[PDB]
Structure 1
Amino acid sequence: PNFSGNWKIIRSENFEELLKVLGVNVMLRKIAVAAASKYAVEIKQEGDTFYIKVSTTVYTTEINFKVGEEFEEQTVDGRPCKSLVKWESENKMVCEQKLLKGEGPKTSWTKELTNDGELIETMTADDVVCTQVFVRE
């Protein structure tokens, strides 16, 4: 499949509960939820290589990886981690993360292209799954 596109968020669920697991205090959780309503994802896919730019109104970052090749990024709350992405099916990829220093909750993310043209992203911390849904601009 082709994940390439400028993706705009239409739905976001359980993001506050995810940040709670990660230790973010309540006021910052509420503002982070508000920031997620301007969450946009720009993807350029070339084969198994992905160039991803994620952004909100005041913050943007780039995540570049090749499936099956370890890279370094951060968890959603900003802890550095080592990451590895694998395919789970034709249209879905899964990323397992391991903290680079210290310990913490078990975190991961997934990306899936649906047959209706939506992009579904999930982020997981231990038992809590946050789900975000996007459509192409």
Structure 2
Amino acid sequence: PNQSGNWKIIRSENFEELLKVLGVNVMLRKIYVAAASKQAVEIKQEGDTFYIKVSTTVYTTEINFKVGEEFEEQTVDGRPCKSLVKWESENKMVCEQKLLKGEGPKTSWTKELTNDGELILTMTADDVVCTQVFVRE
């Protein structure tokens, strides 16, 4: 469908656990967990072109991409990567990430807008998956 709008988080699973297995220090995890709970997500979708802004008190990021065209962003733990998004289905996109420098866990994310109007974001590092669900304001 159309993902454009302001999205508020209603459910999360395994966020701290994802950070923990990525090596994020416990004091920083507490800060990020509290920030993720209050995050604001703005999306502007224009066909295959996406602008996504994720805002919190400690971390704010803008992501710009077109499906099928490589772009640069960061992993969850802050490492620069090259990314490529593809449609897995009509409603779900998948992003594969490759570090610009060095080696690390295989990281990825997915975003799906359900028929319910729920936006489901998953973030993965190797075998560990975090899921966050949003609804449109």
Deviation readout 1:17-56 (Å, 9 max, x if unpaired)? 1101211011211221111101221110111000111111
Q: Secondary structure at the match of 1:83?
A: strand
C-alpha RMSD over aligned residues? 0.8
Deviation readout 1:106-131 (Å, 9 max, x if unpaired)? 00000000111110000000000000
C-alpha displacement at 1:59, in angstroms? 2.8
- CA–CA separation in structure 2 for the residues paired with 1:133 and 1:118: 6
C-alpha displacement at 1:104, in angstroms? 0.8
Q: Secondary structure at the match of 2:28?
A: helix
Q: Structure 1 residues 50-59 or 110-119, which shifts more?
A: 50-59
Deviation readout 1:77-102 (Å, 9 max, x if unpaired)? 10000000000001000000000001
Contact 1:4 1:43 in 2 (8 A): yes
Q: Secondary structure at the match of 1:31?
A: helix
Residue equivalent to 1:97: 97
User: Which ranges of 4 or more aligned residues in structure 1 deviate by more than 3 Å?
Assistant: none
Structure 1: segments with no counterpart, 5+ residues: none
- CA–CA separation in structure 1 for the residues paired with 2:16 and 2:102: 23
Give me the TM-score of the superposition, normalised by structure 2: 0.97
Q: Structure 1 residues 26-35 or 87-96, which shifts more?
A: 26-35
Q: Secondary structure at the match of 2:29?
A: helix
> Matched residues, percent identical?
97
- CA–CA separation in structure 1 for the residues paired with 2:125 and 2:69: 22
Residue equivalent to 1:52: 52
